[PDB]
Amino acid sequence: SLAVYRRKDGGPATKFWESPETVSQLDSVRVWLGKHYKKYVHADAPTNKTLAGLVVQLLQFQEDAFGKHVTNPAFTKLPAKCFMDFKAGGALCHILGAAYKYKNEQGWRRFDLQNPSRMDRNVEMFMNIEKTLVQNNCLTRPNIYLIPDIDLKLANKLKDIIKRHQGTFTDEKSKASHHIYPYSEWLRPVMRKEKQVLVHWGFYPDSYDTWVHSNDVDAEIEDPPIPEKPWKVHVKWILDTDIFNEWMNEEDYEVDENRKPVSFRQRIST
């Protein structure tokens, strides 16, 4: 099986982040930060690789603090896709800008994401990071509509999961991000660099996406579906989110308007 090399944790792929292309991609992030979060980054004058290392520290912190192994975490992991958005006004810029703004506000001499004494203030930073992403339209937490056919006892359990993971639920399908239907081993390649291919493991969150050698994955990378409000997924999308403390990839759980599972892209067996 290829699941041999599946990540056992949602920690950062440090080699991807230290790679020269990624360091190069952060250049526009550094420049954008210098213009719009200037009073918070001017002192530290972060280089491209310093930003890259900060991303590793940030990703490692939320996996250590809010990971699958943590019973009742104080917070839910930020989506891994947020850290993959290197565009000028994108999510990664607001992530780093919020981190530097928060550090300036607390008067910290430096980031210390390994200090157990600073756990609660580091959690506080991530809350400020999530708010910055949401209020700048880079992140939208699920606003969930439960199909009325779901058993009331299950629906109430799903409602508690949704609230414990920064989500809300609504009674008007008009404004729901997701519609949840009753529900009655593979991977998918998502990115290719060098001889490395990033693969997504079915029923695992995006932080568990693993860089593997392209010769072990002959499958073609297909185009991700374009988002049309709302996602139609079944209840295991919410149930699995509670397991990993990280909102699952909707593609793995999608159903059509008759509750039958569908997969826009191909599923490659492990």
Numbering used by the authors: 27 to 210, 217 to 302
Sentences copied from the publication:
SWI/SNF (BAF) chromatin remodelling complexes are key regulators of gene expression programs, and attractive drug targets for cancer therapies. The BAF155/SMARCC1 subunit is a component of all complexes identified to date, incorporated either as a homodimer or as a heterodimer with its paralog BAF170/SMARCC2. In this structure the chromodomain makes interdomain interactions and has lost its canonical function to bind to methylated lysines.
Residues 27–383 of BAF155 were expressed and purified, and their structure determined using X-ray crystallography. We therefore set out to determine the structure of the N-terminus of BAF155 using X-ray crystallography. This shows that the this region contains a distinct structural module where the chromodomain, the BRCT domain and a MarR-like domain are interconnected by a complex hydrogen-bond network. Residues 4–160 form a four-helix-bundle that resembles the MarR-like helix-turn-helix domain10 based on structure homology analysis using VAST:11 43 aligned residues, RMSD for CA atoms of 1.9, score 5.1, P-value = 0.0005 for the highest scoring protein. Residues 169–287 consist of a BRCT domain with a chromodomain (residues 219–246) inserted between the second and third strands of the canonical fold. The individual domains are linked via a network of hydrogen bonds to form a single structural unit in which a highly conserved stretch of amino acids in the α3-α4 loop and α4 of the BRCT domain plays a central role. Residues 28–33 pack onto the chromodomain, and a main-chain to main-chain hydrogen bond is formed between Leu28 and Ile300 linking the N- and C-termini of the module. The N-terminal residues interact with a region of the chromodomain that in others forms an aromatic cage that binds to methylated lysines. The architecture of the fold produces a cleft containing two deep pockets at the interface between the domains. Six missense mutations of BAF155 identified in patient samples that map to the module are predicted to destabilise its structure as judged by Missense3D19.
